[PDB]
């Protein structure tokens, strides 16, 4: 099946884009990346980057997770980063979302060898 690693690339990052460019962007990426095929997923964060500087995050700055794990890391800089939130229309498999375009430090949670981000905690 598919890999924790793999599965984190398909849901967060979009290096062929540096910014959302209109309301519809958490609409179509939300679709296109199968984030919407069971249920609608309800809080989801795209980073505009490089895969290369996202995976050296892991490499950063070691902090605790939301939920108390210490595998997670904190950007030393900021990120170009989308984050999109379901809305009060949002109705399965018509599932809606807010686009919010922002700046700011990514927290990931890396495992592995090579050692590399295998969830989204939060952006700050």
Same mark, same amino acid.
């Given at each position: 099946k598919e890999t924790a690693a793999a599965k984190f690339? *398909?849901?967060? $990052? /979009? +290096? +062929?884009?540096?910014?959302? !460019? +209109? !309301?519809?962007?958490?609409?179509? $990426? $939300?679709? !296109?990346?199968?984030?919407?095929? /069971? *249920?609608?997923?309800p809080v989801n964060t795209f980073v505009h980057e490089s895969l290369a500087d996202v995976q050296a995050v892991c490499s950063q700055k @070691?902090?605790?997770?939301? @939920?108390?794990?210490?595998?997670?890391?904190? +950007?030393?800089s900021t990120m170009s980063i989308t984050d999109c939130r379901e809305t009060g229309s949002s109705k399965y498999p018509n599932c809606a979302y807010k686009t919010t375009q922002a700046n700011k430090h990514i927290i990931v949670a890396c495992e592995g060898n090579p050692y590399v981000p295998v969830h989204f905690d939060a952006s700050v």
């Open positions: 690339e *398909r849901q967060h $990052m /979009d +290096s +062929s884009t540096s910014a959302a !460019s +209109s !309301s519809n962007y958490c609409n179509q $990426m $939300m679709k !296109s990346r199968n984030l919407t095929k /069971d *249920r609608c997923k @070691n902090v605790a997770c939301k @939920n108390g794990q210490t595998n997670c890391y904190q +950007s030393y």
